[PDB]
Amino acid sequence: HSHGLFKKLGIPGPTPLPFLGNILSYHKGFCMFDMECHKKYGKVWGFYDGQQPVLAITDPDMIKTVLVKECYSVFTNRRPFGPVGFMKSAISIAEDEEWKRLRSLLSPTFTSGKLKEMVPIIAQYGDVLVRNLRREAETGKPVTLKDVFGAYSMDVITSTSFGVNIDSLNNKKLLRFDFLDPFFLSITVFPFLIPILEVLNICVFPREVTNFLRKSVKRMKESRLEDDFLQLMIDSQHKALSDLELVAQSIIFIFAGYETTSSVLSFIMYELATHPDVQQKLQEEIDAVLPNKAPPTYDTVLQMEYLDMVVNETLRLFPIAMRLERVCKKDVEINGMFIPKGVVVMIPSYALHRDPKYWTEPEKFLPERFSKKNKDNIDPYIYTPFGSGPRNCIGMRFALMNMKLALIRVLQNFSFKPCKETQIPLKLSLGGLLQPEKPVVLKVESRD
Amino acid sequence: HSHGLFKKLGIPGPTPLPFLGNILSYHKGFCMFDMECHKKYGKVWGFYDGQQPVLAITDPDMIKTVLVKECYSVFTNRRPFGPVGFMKSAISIAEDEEWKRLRSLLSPTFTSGKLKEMVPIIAQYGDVLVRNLRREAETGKPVTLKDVFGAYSMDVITSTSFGVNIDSLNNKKLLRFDFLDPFFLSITVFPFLIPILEVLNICVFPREVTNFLRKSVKRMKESRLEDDFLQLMIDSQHKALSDLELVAQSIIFIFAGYETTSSVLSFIMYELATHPDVQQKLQEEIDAVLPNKAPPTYDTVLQMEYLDMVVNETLRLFPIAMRLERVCKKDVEINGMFIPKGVVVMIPSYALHRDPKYWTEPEKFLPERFSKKNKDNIDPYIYTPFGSGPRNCIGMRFALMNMKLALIRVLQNFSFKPCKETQIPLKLSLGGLLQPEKPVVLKVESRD
Ligand code: HEM
Ligand code: HEM
Ligand SMILES: CC(C)(C)OC(=O)N[C@H](CS[C@H](Cc1ccccc1)C(=O)NCCCc1ccncc1)Cc1ccccc1
Ligand SMILES: CC(C)(C)OC(=O)N[C@H](CS[C@H](Cc1ccccc1)C(=O)NCCCc1ccncc1)Cc1ccccc1
């Protein structure tokens, strides 16, 4: 059917198989397939997720046109995701004017003024992260980073999104997901089954958690009325937000701020343990700005420059999105290249972050790439850990502030050393998520 | 799922059943269901074709806003039809800028200057219609109107669309369709199966005819290059038309000009036979304008006023579209009524044409409603046999000219009387097409 589009347009790419397209090349993950296609075919190439044509671009001027210049007009929505059910009103799922309305309603929620008000409350669970670390560290027992950071990320969420205060590591009925099973694999081969499962109410998000958070929010709403992100959205309610839409955005913010904050913190501490010099220099900067283990503030976090260099370099090596995608809604020609309607434009963030033509020794962990001297030579359309344009990461400021507050309190009291069971070097999962194959385990030693 | 929309909006309508919606009310046809809903619920009502909300409107100002004022912005496309395959490029199927491009490319094709050039060639098969009628009339054998008019309509088509000259009644491999089977009935209950059959290449139009017309056109193109509608589209080729798009429009024009011209001519001659006074007055006007059986011309057809009154009154009683539909693509509020996105706005043409509040004795056949005195009192948004707005019938001029040329030549030589087997009164098919239940049979007598 559509497997002759890139052939007609003169765009190179791997020859697709019937029905499957090029999905069999995903046997080593999205990352390895994007790196091989960038090496084999060059600046632009095309492939097929089954019958769906996917056009990959790597030109920074062409990336700017898709993500920024022609966002509202052509490249407004990501690829259609389903079955989603009521979560269609989710901001990361909504399309066209529905998204542009939800984006404006949730934009003042993620301002620096609202983020600074969260810091003193967020700084409470940094202490919870230390005392729980103190137990597992005081004993000579290696610590799984995904469990200790996953508990902290959930603690920040339940407090910053609903005011719920829980020590999740020691104490809550939020049930998890899975994101790499024969499921989506099949949905890619059979996208015609999406409207099938929608009328069956078969939601990729299991009803019982949505029902829980729906009734949990309505209990909080009518308890505060009359007598966090929830209150910022209650005060917000472009006709005002709906109750079913409000819980849907929470459900996004529950997953976004949880799994992504836990993974990056695990990737950062893996690099700090395998690079003791970077860990020591970061501890010296934290001690210089915050002497006597001073509690970090919103202003002191933005003052640490080497801390920002460590976070940015880690996101370069591990961009958890991997790819940035937009759906071409109208026949357009950008930067001298015609793009038909319906083609999914893709930006290989992982491949561009490790491109030797833009980075010297791209596989190495060198925070000095993001120094105040060298940060000017970084193209913001090649280094996109938070995307770019009107539909970039809306929680970029919150995520960078949440991770740095955790790193400061953790490095103020502990040093992290590799173990025997520590996977060195870290091998990324061959699946569809940017996560370690084996969980990162490290030895935690107290600075006292 | 969606069965609580009209309840939330305060819009009356029949209570829908799960999955089915209100499709079980179609057991007596679209026409009877639209008349009952207009009587029970009033000016506006809503129902569900399965899970699809359909909002019906009858206000002429509100109909003008949907069909004309907000056509390009909101109400641009009809309800999604499939599986269609390559016929997606069909003008009556295309959507948004693809349709607006095809509409502009095919608009000069249907001008009065191009229609007048077709008349002397079209007038050839009016004589074929008489001599073939002369055989079946010279013998005392009643004649089925759908067979004699269906042959004439196909004769005009193959000549005006490809230059092919055939006496189809006596002499062509165009295979037919069916439009009311458990098929669409099921597609309405299960619209999620449309993308299923699309990837299977299961086309509602069977491949072998499309393959025939595709290769037949390419034989005609390269025979005229270098040494009708086809040539008007060849000369036309908004980037120029495609070869696969060109045959697709022909396929539309094959069905549109065939079944619709045969049905209306059968409805007109049924009324003329059951109303001998109208038939005599029409014969007197034709003889006055064209004495001695003068061949009709483009200018003489527009000169006959009582002929236009007969055609317009018949289209009032039998509007073959029955309904006019538009898909609401954006949340809008027109004439003080909010319409959500995705709702199919429907205009019950059959119910409005037989509304006693707009027509005196609506069931009766009275051509005097369209006299030059009374035609001014007719609201063009209540009487819509050809629709209204930018997406109205593009072949309205050709259809009115083709039917009148047939009626003139037929009434110049023959008089039509009812038989014993003639269904009086004519009962419309309880299906989804505006067609007679039993075929119209009449006695044909020569005026000589
Ligand atoms: C290290 C942490 C994070 C990284 C690297 C990250 C990165 C990204 C990226 C690359 C995108 C897509 C941008 C695009 O398509 O142009 C995105 C979207 C998004 N992110 Fe984040 N993110 C992080 C954490 C968070 C957090 C804490 C939130 C909290 C609300 C969040 C909320 C969102 C939302 C709602 C979207 C979709 C925005 C839209 O569709 O308009 N993310 N993120
Ligand atoms: C008695 C004869 C005919 C009647 C009563 C009739 C009526 C109609 C109506 C009511 C519509 C829909 C208008 C709307 O949705 O607003 C339509 C559409 C259309 N008709 Fe006709 N029609 C007739 C014959 C023809 C003929 C001879 C052609 C030859 C090409 C034709 C071509 C079309 C096309 C292409 C469309 C779709 C236009 C678009 O989607 O932009 N029709 N017709
Ligand atoms: C991975 C794959 C390619 C298969 O599909 C997607 O990517 N999933 C999303 C759409 S489902 C999900 C909803 C949800 C809610 C509650 C629990 C579970 C799931 C969501 O909304 N976000 C999940 C990504 C995590 C993230 C969020 C923000 N920031 C950074 C990372 C679309 C998307 C596309 C590009 C970037 C981010 C999200
Ligand atoms: C009836 C139903 C509600 C189920 O679906 C539609 O209505 N079918 C069309 C879309 S399929 C068809 C394509 C085709 C081509 C070759 C052979 C067979 C079929 C088409 O293009 N036309 C067919 C109507 C005849 C007509 C054409 C012009 N003028 C007047 C009448 C959409 C449509 C909607 C409103 C009015 C007209 C057409």
Side-chain angles (χ1 to χ4, degrees):
Chain A
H1 299 279
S2 60
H3 291 180
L5 179 59
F6 298 133
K7 167 191 177 305
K8 185 202 64 177
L9 300 177
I11 296 173
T15 304
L17 300 181
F19 303 99
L20 304 182
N22 303 100
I23 63 170
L24 295 189
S25 302
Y26 289 155
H27 73 288
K28 294 183 178 180
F30 294 121
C31 298
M32 297 298 299
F33 171 70
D34 289 351
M35 293 277 296
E36 293 178 0
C37 277
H38 193 20
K39 165 188 173 60
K40 292 176 182 179
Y41 304 99
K43 65 172 190 301
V44 180
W45 66 90
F47 57 96
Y48 300 89
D49 292 330
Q51 304 286 353
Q52 173 60 231
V54 188
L55 182 61
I57 60 175
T58 60
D59 185 72
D61 294 326
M62 192 176 303
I63 293 175
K64 176 175 185 177
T65 307
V66 174
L67 298 183
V68 180
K69 297 184 178 182
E70 304 296 332
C71 176
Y72 300 113
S73 60
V74 189
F75 312 97
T76 310
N77 317 323
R78 301 180 176 93
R79 77 169 62 195
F81 183 61
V84 294
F86 80 98
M87 294 283 298
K88 60 192 182 310
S89 307
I91 182 180
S92 69
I93 307 182
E95 295 185 0
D96 302 323
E97 302 295 327
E98 279 68 27
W99 161 84
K100 189 155 52 184
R101 163 179 164 270
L102 295 167
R103 185 79 182 190
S104 303
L105 182 61
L106 300 179
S107 295
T109 304
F110 294 88
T111 56
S112 60
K114 303 295 177 55
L115 176 60
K116 180 161 50 188
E117 288 172 299
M118 300 177 179
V119 174
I121 293 90
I122 292 179
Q124 167 189 348
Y125 297 92
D127 306 327
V128 185
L129 176 56
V130 175
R131 291 193 297 274
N132 295 345
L133 245 186
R134 190 137 281 170
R135 182 182 65 198
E136 280 61 281
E138 276 166 342
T139 66
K141 192 190 195 70
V143 186
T144 60
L145 293 188
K146 69 174 187 180
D147 298 327
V148 59
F149 284 139
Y152 164 82
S153 189
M154 180 59 62
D155 289 354
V156 179
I157 282 194
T158 57
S159 54
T160 55
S161 53
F162 309 102
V164 177
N165 298 276
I166 297 182
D167 183 13
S168 301
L169 191 62
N170 294 122
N171 297 86
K172 66 176 181 180
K173 301 178 179 179
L174 328 100
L175 315 176
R176 262 30 269 188
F177 208 79
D178 289 345
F179 262 123
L180 189 26
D181 340 87
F183 185 123
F184 315 81
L185 193 209
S186 310
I187 296 301
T188 303
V189 193
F190 321 116
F192 40 81
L193 306 177
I194 297 179
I196 287 190
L197 311 179
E198 292 280 22
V199 77
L200 310 202
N201 200 16
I202 295 185
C203 184
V204 295
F205 327 108
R207 194 52 55 177
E208 66 175 339
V209 178
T210 63
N211 288 336
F212 176 83
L213 296 180
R214 280 167 67 170
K215 64 190 178 61
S216 298
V217 161
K218 81 162 299 181
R219 290 188 196 101
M220 303 170 186
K221 295 188 60 180
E222 225 168 7
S223 66
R224 306 177 184 182
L225 176 131
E226 303 190 30
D227 181 66
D228 44 59
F229 287 116
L230 172 60
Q231 192 59 39
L232 294 177
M233 299 180 66
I234 290 173
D235 300 331
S236 67
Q237 61 180 177
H238 305 302
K239 204 161 186 176
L241 189 71
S242 173
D243 292 349
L244 190 61
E245 303 184 331
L246 187 146
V247 58
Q249 314 313 313
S250 300
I251 296 173
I252 293 190
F253 299 165
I254 300 324
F255 178 75
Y258 161 69
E259 192 279 327
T260 66
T261 309
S262 311
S263 297
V264 180
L265 286 180
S266 300
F267 283 117
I268 292 177
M269 299 312 299
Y270 168 80
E271 297 300 323
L272 296 182
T274 57
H275 300 73
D277 50 313
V278 178
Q279 181 178 176
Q280 176 177 343
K281 184 176 179 180
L282 185 43
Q283 288 166 330
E284 294 169 353
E285 165 169 289
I286 293 176
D287 294 334
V289 179
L290 305 176
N292 307 123
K293 294 185 180 183
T297 65
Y298 174 87
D299 301 314
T300 53
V301 167
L302 307 181
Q303 189 179 352
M304 304 183 182
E305 294 188 357
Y306 194 75
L307 175 60
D308 185 66
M309 297 163 58
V310 172
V311 176
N312 294 341
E313 171 73 358
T314 304
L315 286 176
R316 185 193 66 87
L317 285 176
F318 308 105
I320 61 171
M322 292 162 297
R323 298 167 158 190
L324 307 176
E325 294 187 2
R326 298 294 189 275
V327 163
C328 185
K329 72 175 62 177
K330 302 287 184 176
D331 279 2
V332 291
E333 174 183 351
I334 54 176
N335 298 89
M337 180 176 304
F338 174 79
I339 300 183
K341 175 181 177 176
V343 181
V344 172
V345 180
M346 190 269 294
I347 296 92
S349 299
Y350 183 93
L352 292 179
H353 288 191
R354 296 171 178 259
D355 189 8
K357 301 186 178 184
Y358 287 103
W359 312 91
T360 61
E361 295 167 313
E363 297 182 357
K364 298 180 61 179
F365 175 78
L366 301 177
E368 296 295 333
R369 309 177 197 263
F370 295 85
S371 62
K372 197 159 55 184
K373 160 198 172 185
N374 303 328
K375 67 162 59 180
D376 311 325
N377 311 327
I378 296 179
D379 199 319
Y381 303 102
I382 301 300
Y383 175 75
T384 57
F386 297 95
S388 182
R391 202 158 188 171
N392 67 328
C393 178
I394 204 180
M396 171 181 59
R397 295 182 142 275
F398 180 84
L400 292 175
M401 182 58 57
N402 185 26
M403 297 178 302
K404 288 174 182 179
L405 282 173
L407 295 174
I408 291 170
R409 222 79 178 102
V410 146
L411 293 171
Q412 272 179 340
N413 299 266
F414 302 103
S415 298
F416 288 66
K417 316 251 182 177
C419 294
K420 180 189 67 176
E421 47 274 47
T422 300
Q423 187 182 43
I424 304 179
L426 176 143
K427 301 184 182 304
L428 271 167
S429 174
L430 266 59
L433 308 170
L434 205 63
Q435 288 169 345
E437 183 190 30
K438 242 62 196 65
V440 186
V441 289
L442 293 177
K443 178 169 55 183
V444 185
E445 299 179 356
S446 180
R447 300 181 65 182
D448 150 67
Chain B
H1 299 279
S2 60
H3 291 180
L5 179 59
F6 298 133
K7 167 191 177 305
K8 185 202 64 177
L9 300 177
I11 296 173
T15 304
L17 300 181
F19 303 99
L20 304 182
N22 303 100
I23 63 170
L24 295 189
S25 302
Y26 289 155
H27 73 288
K28 294 183 178 180
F30 294 121
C31 298
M32 297 298 299
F33 171 70
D34 289 351
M35 293 277 296
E36 293 178 0
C37 277
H38 193 20
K39 165 188 173 60
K40 292 176 182 179
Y41 304 99
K43 65 172 190 301
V44 180
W45 66 90
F47 57 96
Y48 300 89
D49 292 330
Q51 304 286 353
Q52 173 60 231
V54 188
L55 182 61
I57 60 175
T58 60
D59 185 72
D61 294 326
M62 192 176 303
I63 293 175
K64 176 175 185 177
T65 307
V66 174
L67 298 183
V68 180
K69 297 184 178 182
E70 304 296 332
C71 176
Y72 300 113
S73 60
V74 189
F75 312 97
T76 310
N77 317 323
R78 301 180 176 93
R79 77 169 62 195
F81 183 61
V84 294
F86 80 98
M87 294 283 298
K88 60 192 182 310
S89 307
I91 182 180
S92 69
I93 307 182
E95 295 185 0
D96 302 323
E97 302 295 327
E98 279 68 27
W99 161 84
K100 189 155 52 184
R101 163 179 164 270
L102 295 167
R103 185 79 182 190
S104 303
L105 182 61
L106 300 179
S107 295
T109 304
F110 294 88
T111 56
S112 60
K114 303 295 177 55
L115 176 60
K116 180 161 50 188
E117 288 172 299
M118 300 177 179
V119 174
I121 293 90
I122 292 179
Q124 167 189 348
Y125 297 92
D127 306 327
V128 185
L129 176 56
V130 175
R131 291 193 297 274
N132 295 345
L133 245 186
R134 190 137 281 170
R135 182 182 65 198
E136 280 61 281
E138 276 166 342
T139 66
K141 192 190 195 70
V143 186
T144 60
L145 293 188
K146 69 174 187 180
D147 298 327
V148 59
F149 284 139
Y152 164 82
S153 189
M154 180 59 62
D155 289 354
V156 179
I157 282 194
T158 57
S159 54
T160 55
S161 53
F162 309 102
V164 177
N165 298 276
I166 297 182
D167 183 13
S168 301
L169 191 62
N170 294 122
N171 297 86
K172 66 176 181 180
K173 301 178 179 179
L174 328 100
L175 315 176
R176 262 30 269 188
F177 208 79
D178 289 345
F179 262 123
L180 189 26
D181 340 87
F183 185 123
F184 315 81
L185 193 209
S186 310
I187 296 301
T188 303
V189 193
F190 321 116
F192 40 81
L193 306 177
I194 297 179
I196 287 190
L197 311 179
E198 292 280 22
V199 77
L200 310 202
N201 200 16
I202 295 185
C203 184
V204 295
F205 327 108
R207 194 52 55 177
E208 66 175 339
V209 178
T210 63
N211 288 336
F212 176 83
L213 296 180
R214 280 167 67 170
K215 64 190 178 61
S216 298
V217 161
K218 81 162 299 181
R219 290 188 196 101
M220 303 170 186
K221 295 188 60 180
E222 225 168 7
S223 66
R224 306 177 184 182
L225 176 131
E226 303 190 30
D227 181 66
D228 44 59
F229 287 116
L230 172 60
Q231 192 59 39
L232 294 177
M233 299 180 66
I234 290 173
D235 300 331
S236 67
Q237 61 180 177
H238 305 302
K239 204 161 186 176
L241 189 71
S242 173
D243 292 349
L244 190 61
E245 303 184 331
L246 187 146
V247 58
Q249 314 313 313
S250 300
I251 296 173
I252 293 190
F253 299 165
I254 300 324
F255 178 75
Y258 161 69
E259 192 279 327
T260 66
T261 309
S262 311
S263 297
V264 180
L265 286 180
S266 300
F267 283 117
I268 292 177
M269 299 312 299
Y270 168 80
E271 297 300 323
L272 296 182
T274 57
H275 300 73
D277 50 313
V278 178
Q279 181 178 176
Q280 176 177 343
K281 184 176 179 180
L282 185 43
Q283 288 166 330
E284 294 169 353
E285 165 169 289
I286 293 176
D287 294 334
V289 179
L290 305 176
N292 307 123
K293 294 185 180 183
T297 65
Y298 174 87
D299 301 314
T300 53
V301 167
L302 307 181
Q303 189 179 352
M304 304 183 182
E305 294 188 357
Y306 194 75
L307 175 60
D308 185 66
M309 297 163 58
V310 172
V311 176
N312 294 341
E313 171 73 358
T314 304
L315 286 176
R316 185 193 66 87
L317 285 176
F318 308 105
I320 61 171
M322 292 162 297
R323 298 167 158 190
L324 307 176
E325 294 187 2
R326 298 294 189 275
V327 163
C328 185
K329 72 175 62 177
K330 302 287 184 176
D331 279 2
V332 291
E333 174 183 351
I334 54 176
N335 298 89
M337 180 176 304
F338 174 79
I339 300 183
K341 175 181 177 176
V343 181
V344 172
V345 180
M346 190 269 294
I347 296 92
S349 299
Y350 183 93
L352 292 179
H353 288 191
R354 296 171 178 259
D355 189 8
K357 301 186 178 184
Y358 287 103
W359 312 91
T360 61
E361 295 167 313
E363 297 182 357
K364 298 180 61 179
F365 175 78
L366 301 177
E368 296 295 333
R369 309 177 197 263
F370 295 85
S371 62
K372 197 159 55 184
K373 160 198 172 185
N374 303 328
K375 67 162 59 180
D376 311 325
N377 311 327
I378 296 179
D379 199 319
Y381 303 102
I382 301 300
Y383 175 75
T384 57
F386 297 95
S388 182
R391 202 158 188 171
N392 67 328
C393 178
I394 204 180
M396 171 181 59
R397 295 182 142 275
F398 180 84
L400 292 175
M401 182 58 57
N402 185 26
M403 297 178 302
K404 288 174 182 179
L405 282 173
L407 295 174
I408 291 170
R409 222 79 178 102
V410 146
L411 293 171
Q412 272 179 340
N413 299 266
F414 302 103
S415 298
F416 288 66
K417 316 251 182 177
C419 294
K420 180 189 67 176
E421 47 274 47
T422 300
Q423 187 182 43
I424 304 179
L426 176 143
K427 301 184 182 304
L428 271 167
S429 174
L430 266 59
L433 308 170
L434 205 63
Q435 288 169 345
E437 183 190 30
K438 242 62 196 65
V440 186
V441 289
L442 293 177
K443 178 169 55 183
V444 185
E445 299 179 356
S446 180
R447 300 181 65 182
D448 150 67

